[PDB]
Write a protein that binds this ligand. Structure first.
Ligand SMILES: *[C@@H]1O[C@H](CO)[C@@H](O[C@@H]2O[C@H](CO)[C@@H](O[C@@H]3O[C@H](CO[C@H]4O[C@H](CO)[C@@H](O)[C@H](O)[C@@H]4O)[C@@H](O)[C@H](O[C@H]4O[C@H](CO)[C@@H](O)[C@H](O)[C@@H]4O[C@H]4O[C@H](CO)[C@@H](O)[C@H](O)[C@@H]4O)[C@@H]3O)[C@H](O)[C@H]2NC(C)=O)[C@H](O)[C@H]1NC(C)=O
Ligand SMILES: *[C@@H]1O[C@H](CO)[C@@H](O[C@@H]2O[C@H](CO)[C@@H](O[C@@H]3O[C@H](CO[C@H]4O[C@H](CO)[C@@H](O)[C@H](O)[C@@H]4O)[C@@H](O)[C@H](O[C@H]4O[C@H](CO)[C@@H](O)[C@H](O)[C@@H]4O[C@H]4O[C@H](CO)[C@@H](O)[C@H](O)[C@@H]4O)[C@@H]3O)[C@H](O)[C@H]2NC(C)=O)[C@H](O)[C@H]1NC(C)=O
Ligand SMILES: *[C@@H]1O[C@H](CO)[C@@H](O[C@@H]2O[C@H](CO)[C@@H](O[C@@H]3O[C@H](CO[C@H]4O[C@H](CO)[C@@H](O)[C@H](O)[C@@H]4O)[C@@H](O)[C@H](O[C@H]4O[C@H](CO)[C@@H](O)[C@H](O)[C@@H]4O[C@H]4O[C@H](CO)[C@@H](O)[C@H](O)[C@@H]4O)[C@@H]3O)[C@H](O)[C@H]2NC(C)=O)[C@H](O)[C@H]1NC(C)=O
Ligand SMILES: *[C@@H]1O[C@H](CO)[C@@H](O[C@@H]2O[C@H](CO)[C@@H](O[C@@H]3O[C@H](CO[C@H]4O[C@H](CO)[C@@H](O)[C@H](O)[C@@H]4O)[C@@H](O)[C@H](O[C@H]4O[C@H](CO)[C@@H](O)[C@H](O)[C@@H]4O[C@H]4O[C@H](CO)[C@@H](O)[C@H](O)[C@@H]4O)[C@@H]3O)[C@H](O)[C@H]2NC(C)=O)[C@H](O)[C@H]1NC(C)=O
Ligand SMILES: *[C@@H]1O[C@H](CO[C@@H]2O[C@@H](C)[C@@H](O)[C@@H](O)[C@@H]2O)[C@@H](O[C@@H]2O[C@H](CO)[C@@H](O[C@@H]3O[C@H](CO[C@H]4O[C@H](CO)[C@@H](O)[C@H](O)[C@@H]4O)[C@@H](O)[C@H](O[C@H]4O[C@H](CO)[C@@H](O)[C@H](O)[C@@H]4O)[C@@H]3O)[C@H](O)[C@H]2NC(C)=O)[C@H](O)[C@H]1NC(C)=O
Ligand SMILES: *[C@@H]1O[C@H](CO[C@@H]2O[C@@H](C)[C@@H](O)[C@@H](O)[C@@H]2O)[C@@H](O[C@@H]2O[C@H](CO)[C@@H](O[C@@H]3O[C@H](CO)[C@@H](O)[C@H](O)[C@@H]3O)[C@H](O)[C@H]2NC(C)=O)[C@H](O)[C@H]1NC(C)=O
Ligand SMILES: *[C@@H]1O[C@H](CO[C@@H]2O[C@@H](C)[C@@H](O)[C@@H](O)[C@@H]2O)[C@@H](O[C@@H]2O[C@H](CO)[C@@H](O[C@@H]3O[C@H](CO)[C@@H](O)[C@H](O)[C@@H]3O)[C@H](O)[C@H]2NC(C)=O)[C@H](O)[C@H]1NC(C)=O
Ligand SMILES: *[C@@H]1O[C@H](CO[C@@H]2O[C@@H](C)[C@@H](O)[C@@H](O)[C@@H]2O)[C@@H](O[C@@H]2O[C@H](CO)[C@@H](O[C@@H]3O[C@H](CO)[C@@H](O)[C@H](O)[C@@H]3O)[C@H](O)[C@H]2NC(C)=O)[C@H](O)[C@H]1NC(C)=O
Ligand SMILES: *[C@@H]1O[C@H](CO)[C@@H](O[C@@H]2O[C@H](CO)[C@@H](O[C@@H]3O[C@H](CO)[C@@H](O)[C@H](O)[C@@H]3O)[C@H](O)[C@H]2NC(C)=O)[C@H](O)[C@H]1NC(C)=O
Ligand SMILES: *[C@@H]1O[C@H](CO)[C@@H](O[C@@H]2O[C@H](CO)[C@@H](O[C@@H]3O[C@H](CO)[C@@H](O)[C@H](O)[C@@H]3O)[C@H](O)[C@H]2NC(C)=O)[C@H](O)[C@H]1NC(C)=O
Ligand SMILES: *[C@@H]1O[C@H](CO)[C@@H](O[C@@H]2O[C@H](CO)[C@@H](O)[C@H](O)[C@H]2NC(C)=O)[C@H](O)[C@H]1NC(C)=O
Ligand SMILES: *[C@@H]1O[C@H](CO)[C@@H](O[C@@H]2O[C@H](CO)[C@@H](O)[C@H](O)[C@H]2NC(C)=O)[C@H](O)[C@H]1NC(C)=O
Lengths: 104, 151, 185, 97, 106, 125, 151, 151, 104
């Protein structure tokens, strides 16, 4: 399965929320993962499952959706939140990553 | 035969806000859900199996034309016990309070938070029996889980 | 040879269903097209999915076949169990039969929510184990005809081992999804 | 017009026994086809006045054509053919003549 | 229903040359066409079945190709015994259809 | 808990690259290792996953034969070997820890994602 | 309708070399066998009852034309649970590893020789699952064996 | 399916003089009746359920035209286990002593007065088996019940 | 049921194996007993069941067969193995012995 991200870029000023979308080719029941990658850094797991936060992740990030359609919402987007966000499905093999969208 | 469906997911089962009316999410622990896999005469267990099967069928199988009568007719006997509803039908015939599978009651531990397996509310005159007329039953329930608290 | 918990060893066994003959029919699959259900070490039924049909007439001589008690009773029982288990069967014209001389030959026309869907459900419930290759459910396949004939026993199936699960499964749901054709039954 | 054709050997079950007509100055055409059962296919042009019969006991198949017309004189061949329908590449070949 | 038409009709070809014979159906076929050779005053013999395979004893100079609508039989070299009529057939289901045929002469 | 991928190195095209990631802070045999390749300027790309329990490997569609994975539970190490290099093979390789997917008769599948990642190892040809 | 067939024979059951492929005589103790008479969701117990019924039918009764479909049709529900294979069919439909009735796995004690009740080997994509993908179930079985050994 | 009828009434069951031939009333304690709600292969439990259903139908329902086949047809599966009589028929076929649900035997404690759950008597050659040919079963039942009362 | 022993006489020198056959009128599933009687002494139970030896019986004697046909084999016949061998079914009443066999 191949999944794509709709915005592909986001020039958003700090202070307000940010919304990211992820569309899957086939059905992926709550088996999604959202990662963030800082410039020149290894990616880290932000959201595992559809709407479950990883340990040590601030409550600003929140996942939602199911089936084919998934969304990620950041309430108070700050300076440290400027990274590249990746959408991955792990419902079946091989594991597929999204094209990624840049939040600048 | 007997039912073979196993409830999904520590070890308990949680009913979401859609499975109840005028209520929020409600979780039941492992010690109560585990009784659903051996008791052949629990009404709440059968209904909870029905809800779990519906959720899994919605999640995994595709939906089209909503003609899922074949699916439910194929696996009706793997989820519930028909003799339970038959027993309720006979009890209704004999002019005795019966159960139409709508309302359930359970016991809460106020501090610990552990609960018992819900039992369904009996009905007479098309109205629910009131807590006094089965109060003894409730007492028994408490005693039972008190014994379960002993170990 | 991993050791679990430092004291337990994992071991496996495989069951020989082929010794269950003479008491239960055994079903297994040869390849995509050919499937078999065997009774004893003598007889069996071969089920094939084909684009080529063998019966052109739209007849089914069931009463006449019953009158001349020439067929094998076991195979007739098996085909009756198969036919009764078809869910929501309403196109009687889509099934053709030939019973002349004591042989049995059934042809199902598969040309959703149609007769082909139910026929495929019953088929892969019968030949359960190797019929998944030709896959709510809404089953659709490129084949046009399903042919059931009788055959002698042979080392046919090489894709899946023999197993009585499919027949024992369709035994339970026999008269469960049949439509009513008459007021009095 | 009555004709008969018996098989030399091999097996009679699982094949299609067709009849082919070659008129003088015309091409080959298929007029009928039967299998080891009673199932039969006919050419619509002459379907009205054509019958094909099969006897499995002696492994023989026969053709009968009524209302013989002087324009129906031709060369008649009885052929055995096989049809494959288990995989996508599908082939029907008139095996022997 | 389905009709097979052969584009070549009468081919006067010199010996030892390539002979292409293409025939096509009205619509997409279910069974791949079968090619036969018919000698003058003799029973026809099978040449190609499945549009790509060869019968037993068939010389390697006969080849087949095609998919969907067009089907072609190719002859690598011509011989005096290779001058005959050629047909392509389709069966579908219980309805065998031949072609008008094409002839080879020196 | 972290993973160390032994720095990075570069070599001329046509050679072989051997990238090692060492796990620590947890029981190695309970978690498998997944390998992710990120080309310079491009997004992440999955390569394969090897279970440290017994060595069972799931490979990518286009990486069979070209790329191999090995494990060593004696020293808590996972190794990735690439035999053929090309101008487009320059990238950054990440070693990630992933729990194997679990199935049971009385239960439902439990699938897992990549929990922790090591620092990337860059390879340029 | 629950099954009623009881397995023959101290107290265990022995699978002879004929019921197993590429294997010799195998034997399971009383503790493992006793679970087959209480639980309604074990495939190995159902197949073991089928094998016992076949053996007893061969020994006790005669043979004629091998058309004994009537006997199995009369006693199909006294040996197995049809809802078990129904549940396996549902799991197969939903794209989940199911219980192909061919292979089984069990845990052997290295020195004592005690053996757990075999569980069927799950299959997916027409290939057997590999133990790296159900090691948690094996650990749970080992934990249950240790707990039973404690008592 | 599985039977869901619960026996009437501390907690034991008493068979009146009408239910027995050439005998008076006989009472069985709760420790024996409680087994009838969980076991699936006890003749006496099914017969007790049948007798209780007959008594309740007589008491709480009217009678007319003696056309009560409808009620027993509706409620047959909620009282008895069909596979149990199927097993008895199979054992009869194979030339093995069986049970036609007529005679039962149980163990009485002379002083305490506690009784075991009755086991139905076996018939071979159309005659009741003598005590000497199933004495080991009696000893096993006594051992099991002494073990139960020990705890 | 009546069972017969066809050979009834085995004149074999010591050293080689001997085989005795027992055939029953009806079906006797693995419920057969082989007894040995020395000249003038009481019979002793050699084999009980189809293929199970009694306690203290040397492994030379081996039972086999089922249903109607049963066989008893002695591998290394010693000096004390010369005795009369008897076949008794106990699948149903009354118990019936065989005509016996004189093995010398
Ligand atoms: C098992 O057995 C029990 C025992 O009886 C049984 O409980 C009974 O369930 C029924 C079904 O819900 C209950 O009937 C409901 O009663 C409420 C309350 O009615 C009072 O208030 C109205 C004024 O609103 C008075 O007229 C009335 O006399 C009562 O004083 C009703 O409000 C319900 O009707 C609404 O819901 C229906 C659901 O579809 C609608 O169809 C209906 O049109 C009403 O909706 C309207 O109002 C809504 C709110 O304003 C609005 O959103 C809608 O758009 C619409 O305008 C309903 O009649 C009955 O009270 C229960 N009995 C007791 C003693 O509690 C179980 O149902 C049974 N279970 C099963 C599975 O069989
Ligand atoms: C549960 O799910 C599993 C897996 O999903 C499934 O198990 C599979 O069952 C099939 C059917 O038994 C197995 O297929 C067999 O494979 C063996 C070995 O495969 C290779 O064998 C040789 C190399 O040894 C290669 O040349 C060959 O191409 C294969 O790659 C085959 O040997 C088997 O064929 C023999 O047995 C058949 C059945 O008896 C015969 O029809 C066939 O002609 C072969 O017999 C010939 O050889 C014999 C000696 O080998 C000889 O004795 C015969 O006389 C004859 O000459 C067969 O194809 C498959 O391996 C299993 N496993 C997998 C992973 O697929 C179960 O069936 C399923 N359970 C149920 C109930 O369905
Ligand atoms: C799943 O598995 C099944 C069975 O394993 C398989 O079906 C089989 O398909 C093959 C086609 O690949 C069939 O093979 C043909 O069979 C016909 C029928 O004749 C005999 O068929 C059976 C099997 O022998 C006999 O029991 C029966 O009584 C018939 O006698 C043959 O006529 C075919 O032979 C001709 O073609 C071959 C090449 O394809 C040549 O090698 C052969 O010599 C024949 O060609 C020549 O014949 C004449 C000489 O005799 C000559 O004069 C002609 O000019 C011509 O050139 C061929 O063997 C096989 O029968 C099928 N089996 C069954 C039971 O139906 C499925 O295909 C498979 N499914 C999938 C998806 O793979
Ligand atoms: C499960 O399997 C067991 C074992 O097979 C089976 O047990 C048998 O049950 C039957 C039940 O009928 C028993 O048969 C009874 O036997 C008595 C004893 O007979 C003696 O006395 C008579 C003289 O009366 C002698 O001729 C005889 O040789 C014996 O010495 C009979 O007396 C019974 O008949 C009377 O009762 C019947 C009830 O309907 C009357 O129809 C019949 O006419 C007889 O009536 C007489 O007595 C009445 C008072 O009771 C009186 O009013 C009449 O006027 C008349 O005088 C009956 O035949 C049989 O012995 C049992 N076998 C054993 C070995 O004990 C179970 O029945 C079976 N359970 C099932 C199938 O559910
Ligand atoms: C689940 O997956 C397990 C691992 O996954 C496999 O990994 C590799 C090995 C590939 O096979 C890959 O395709 C699999 O996904 C799997 O366990 C492994 O299974 C293989 C196959 O049987 C075993 O390989 C055999 O090895 C022995 C020697 O064993 C020693 O060396 C190996 C390294 O090769 C060590 O890992 C072991 O611990 C031992 O120290 C070989 O003798 C054998 O045949 C070879 O030799 C003969 C004769 O010379 C040649 O003809 C052959 O071609 C071979 O060269 C195998 O190669 C492997 O040992 C085993 N590892 C473990 C840890 O168990 C497991 O079987 C899978 N379960 C399933 C599929 O149900
Ligand atoms: C069982 O039998 C009847 C049925 O009860 C009635 O029907 C049910 C389906 C429900 O809707 C009940 O809520 C409903 O009452 C019982 O008789 C009923 O008693 C009540 C007493 O409160 C009657 O209500 C009164 O009605 C009068 C006249 O309309 C008013 O003036 C009063 O203010 C009050 O509302 C009710 O009418 C009556 N039912 C009928 C059909 O007349 C009966 O009591 C009950 N048995 C027991 C033991 O409780
Ligand atoms: C059985 O026969 C069907 C065709 O049967 C014909 O079509 C039916 C809809 C009915 O009308 C029948 O009466 C009629 O005779 C086979 O369907 C065929 O499938 C193949 C493979 O999918 C198709 O081949 C094409 O190949 C090209 C090139 O790769 C692709 O681009 C196409 O997408 C397609 O795959 C072929 O067109 C199709 N024929 C049709 C639709 O008429 C069917 O496969 C066959 N089954 C077997 C097992 O042989
Ligand atoms: C699910 O299964 C399919 C098919 O599985 C095949 O049939 C089963 C009954 C088992 O016997 C499997 O072992 C068998 O593969 C998988 O698709 C197939 O995957 C294999 C590799 O796993 C492919 O084989 C490759 O073939 C190429 C040449 O084309 C070689 O270069 C490779 O080295 C390799 O051998 C095979 O082509 C492919 N397709 C088919 C029709 O078999 C599928 O990957 C698997 N998983 C999923 C998620 O679908
Ligand atoms: C149908 O199933 C029956 C079993 O119910 C199979 O019969 C069995 O066949 C095997 C192989 O021929 C027999 O094994 C033999 O055992 C004797 C000892 O008794 C040994 O000396 C031989 O060397 C051989 O190994 C087995 O006894 C036999 N069982 C019975 C009860 O007869 C039969 O093979 C199956 N048929 C098919 C077509 O699969
Ligand atoms: C299997 O089922 C298919 C589908 O029903 C059958 O094909 C159908 O066959 C009938 C004839 O029996 C065709 O009807 C004819 O249609 C033509 C054209 O409209 C008309 O001129 C004729 O008078 C006649 O009514 C029908 O069109 C045809 N449908 C399709 C989709 O092909 C097929 O015959 C069945 N197979 C067997 C062996 O019976
Ligand atoms: C049993 O009672 C406890 C409280 O004593 C319930 O737990 C509460 O649940 C609500 C809703 O999720 C929360 O808002 C409260 O914070 C919880 N209280 C505590 C102390 O945790 C519990 O839900 C009850 N059991 C059931 C089955 O309803
Ligand atoms: C299908 O069954 C029929 C009926 O038994 C078989 O036809 C008979 O087969 C027997 C056994 O060879 C012959 O003795 C009879 O003469 C046959 N009767 C007729 C009318 O043909 C038929 O052979 C079976 N099919 C296959 C493929 O074995």
């Amino acid at each position: 399965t191949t999944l794509t991200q709709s915005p592909a870029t986001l020039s958003v000023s700090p202070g307000e929320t940010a919304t990211l979308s992820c569309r899957a080719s086939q059905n992926v029941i709550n088996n999604l993962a959202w990662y963030q990658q800082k410039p020149g850094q290894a990616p880290r797991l932000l959201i595992y499952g559809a709407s479950t936060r990883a340990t040590g992740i601030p409550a600003r990030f929140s996942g939602s959706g199911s089936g084919t359609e998934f969304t990620l919402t950041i309430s108070s987007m700050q300076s440290e939140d400027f990274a590249v966000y990746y959408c991955q499905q792990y419902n079946d093999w091989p594991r597929s990553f999204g094209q990624g969208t840049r939040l600048d | 035969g007997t039912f073979t469906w196993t409830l999904s997911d520590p070890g308990g089962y949680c009913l979401t806000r859609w499975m109840l009316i005028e209520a929020e999410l409600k979780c039941f622990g492992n010690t109560a859900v585990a009784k659903c896999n051996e008791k052949h005469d629990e009404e709440f267990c059968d209904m909870l199996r029905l809800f779990d099967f519906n959720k899994q069928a919605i999640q995994r199988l595709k939906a089209e034309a909503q003609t899922s009568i074949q699916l439910i007719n194929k696996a009706v006997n793997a989820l519930i016990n028909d003799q339970l509803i038959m027993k309720n039908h006979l009890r209704d015939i004999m002019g005795i309070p019966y159960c139409n599978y709508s309302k359930y009651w359970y016991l809460n531990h106020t501090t610990t938070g552990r609960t018992s397996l819900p039992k369904c509310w009996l009905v007479s005159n098309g109205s629910y029996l009131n807590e006094t007329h089965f109060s003894d039953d409730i007492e028994q329930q408490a005693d039972n889980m008190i014994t379960e608290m002993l170990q | 040879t991993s050791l679990y918990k430092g004291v337990y060893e994992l071991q496996t066994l495989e069951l020989n269903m082929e010794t269950l003959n003479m008491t239960m029919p055994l079903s297994c699959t040869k390849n995509n097209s050919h499937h078999y259900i065997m009774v004893g070490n003598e007889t069996g039924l071969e089920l094939t999915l084909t684009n080529t049909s063998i019966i052109n007439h739209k007849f089914c001589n069931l009463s006449d076949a019953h009158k001349k008690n020439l067929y094998d009773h076991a195979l007739m029982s098996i085909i009756s169990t198969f036919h009764l288990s078809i869910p929501n069967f309403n196109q009687y014209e889509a099934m053709s039969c030939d019973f002349n001389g004591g042989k049995i030959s059934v042809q199902y026309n598969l040309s959703c929510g149609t007769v082909a869907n139910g026929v495929l459900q019953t088929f892969m419930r019968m030949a359960w184990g190797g019929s998944y290759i030709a896959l709510w459910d809404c089953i659709m396949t490129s084949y046009q005809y399903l042919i059931i004939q009788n055959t002698t026993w042979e080392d046919h199936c090489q894709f899946s081992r023999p197993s009585p699960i499919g027949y024992l499964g369709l035994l339970s749901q026999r008269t469960r999804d049949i439509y009513i054709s008459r007021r009095l039954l | 017009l009555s004709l008969s054709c018996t098989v030399d050997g091999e097996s009679f079950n699982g094949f299609f026994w067709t009849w082919i007509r070659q008129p003088p100055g015309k091409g080959l055409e298929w007029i009928g086809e039967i299998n080891h059962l009673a199932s039969t296919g006919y050419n619509p042009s002459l379907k009205s006045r054509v019958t094909i019969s099969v006897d499995t006991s002696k492994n023989q198949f026969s053709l009968k054509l009524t209302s013989v017309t002087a324009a129906d004189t031709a060369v008649y061949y009885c052929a055995r053919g096989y049809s494959y329908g288990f995989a996508w590449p599908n082939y029907h070949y008139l095996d022997v003549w | 229903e389905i009709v097979l038409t052969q584009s070549p009709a009468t081919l006067s070809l010199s010996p030892g040359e390539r002979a292409t014979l293409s025939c096509r159906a009205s619509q997409s076929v279910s069974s791949y066409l079968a090619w036969y050779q018919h000698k003058p005053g003799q029973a026809p013999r099978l040449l190609i079945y499945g549009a790509s395979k060869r019968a037993t004893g068939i010389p390697s100079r006969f080849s087949g190709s095609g998919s969907g609508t067009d089907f072609s039989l190719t002859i690598s070299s011509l011989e005096p015994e290779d001058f005959a009529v050629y047909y392509c057939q389709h069966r579908s289901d219980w309805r065998t259809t031949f072609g008008q045929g094409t002839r080879l002469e020196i | 808990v972290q993973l160390v991928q032994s720095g990075a190195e570069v070599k001329k095209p046509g050679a072989s690259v051997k990238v090692s990631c060492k796990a620590s802070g947890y029981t190695f045999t309970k978690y498998g290792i997944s390998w992710v390749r990120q080309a310079p300027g491009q997004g992440l790309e999955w390569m394969g996953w090897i279970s440290a329990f017994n060595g069972y490997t799931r490979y990518g569609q286009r990486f069979q034969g070209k790329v191999t994975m090995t494990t060593d539970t004696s020293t808590n190490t996972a190794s990735l070997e690439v035999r053929t290099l090309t101008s487009n093979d320059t990238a950054v390789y990440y070693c990630a820890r992933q729990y194997p997917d679990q199935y049971s008769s009385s239960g439902w599948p439990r699938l897992f994602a990549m929990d922790v990642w090591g620092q990337g190892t860059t390879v340029t040809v």
